[PDB]
């Protein structure tokens, strides 16, 4: 029941499925086999945002450390195209975690693994201005690679990072949440792996496709741009499905809302980092919690109305 779970186990399940519901981050680690030195960090972003009328704005919540989400607006009734590029919206203090250069990401921490990844939209529009819809579904986006030959001198074969299953963003999958904008929405993501394995921090990634690579040779349907290495960047790709969100704004509609995003992440601190002094041991295994997690996750709906979160 609720008594078979160890403190860490209960806490884990909370930071993973219902974070607004608490005055404090319950999370204290992942109750799995691993008990090494880690650092629990619950990233919380709060952002007053107003949507562009006559434009459908797409938001991805995806397991990129430091970055809450990625957005981009396109013409109403359309999906992202090769001409589209998503830009990040960092969680507080990105730079303080992964530096300001594309090659100083692993300065503080070496690897990581996500526990939870939630998101919520809270309409703040009055009943005389709001209009539109909020559609939500999830994509199994994984970070892979693409091999192709290059006619250089001498001729060589390149290999770079590619996002696989990105194409799923160009269609609203049969499993989805779709409701009037005003009703807002809440949705969370979970580990898309049979176990919580660590993922290494990635150095030098600012764009995908990367510099000197055509979108065509990567297969990816659109482009990812984190911008100036001094402000943002891609530090890694977690094992969580990516939450896709389509917000349709009619022409002449005033859609304002607040956006929140949670992320319980466990990092492997570097002995040199000023982080280290905050670390502790990963929570010990909790069979019960790990089973509840799997079950609860698969049981919960794609998303729910913003009214309840």
């Amino acid at each position: 029941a609720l008594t078979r779970l160890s403190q860490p186990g209960l806490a884990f399940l909370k930071c993973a499925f219902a974070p607004p519901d608490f005055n404090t981050d319950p999370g204290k680690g992942i109750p799995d086999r691993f008990e090494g030195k880690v650092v629990s960090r619950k990233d919380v972003l709060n952002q007053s945002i107003s949507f562009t009328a006559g434009q459908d704005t797409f938001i991805l919540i995806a397991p990129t450390p430091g970055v809450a989400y990625w957005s981009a607006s396109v013409p109403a009734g359309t999906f992202p195209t090769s001409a589209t590029t998503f830009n990040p919206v960092n969680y507080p203090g990105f730079t303080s975690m992964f530096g300001t250069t594309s090659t100083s990401r692993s300065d503080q921490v070496s690897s990581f693994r996500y526990a939870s990844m939630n998101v919520g939209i809270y309409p703040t529009s009055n009943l005389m201005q709001f209009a539109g819809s909020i559609t939500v579904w999830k994509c199994p986006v994984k970070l892979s690679t693409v091999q192709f030959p290059v006619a250089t001198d001498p001729a060589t074969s390149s290999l770079v990072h590619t996002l696989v299953g990105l194409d799923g963003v160009l269609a609203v999958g049969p499993d989805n949440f779709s409701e009037s904008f005003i009703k807002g929405v809440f949705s969370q993501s979970a580990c898309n792996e049979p176990d919580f394995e660590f993922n290494d921090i990635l150095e030098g990634i600012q764009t995908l496709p990367p510099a000197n690579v055509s979108l065509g040779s990567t297969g990816q349907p659109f482009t990812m741009d984190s911008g100036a290495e001094a402000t943002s960047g891609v530090v890694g790709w977690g094992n969580m499905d990516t939450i896709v969100i389509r917000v349709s704004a009619p022409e002449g509609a005033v859609n304002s809302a607040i956006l929140k995003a949670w992320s319980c992440i466990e990092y492997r601190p570097n002995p040199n980092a000023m982080l280290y002094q905050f670390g502790h041991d990963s929570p010990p295994l909790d069979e019960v919690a790990l089973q509840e997690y799997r079950t609860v996750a698969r049981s919960l709906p794609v998303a729910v109305i913003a009214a309840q979160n």
Partner: peptide, 17 residues
């Protein structure tokens, strides 16, 4: 109309079988 409670329910519902 709570979230945590929908989680506490799916936990005590599957732990009954």
């Amino acid at each position: 109309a709570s979230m945590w409670e929908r989680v506490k329910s799916i936990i005590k519902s599957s732990l009954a079988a």
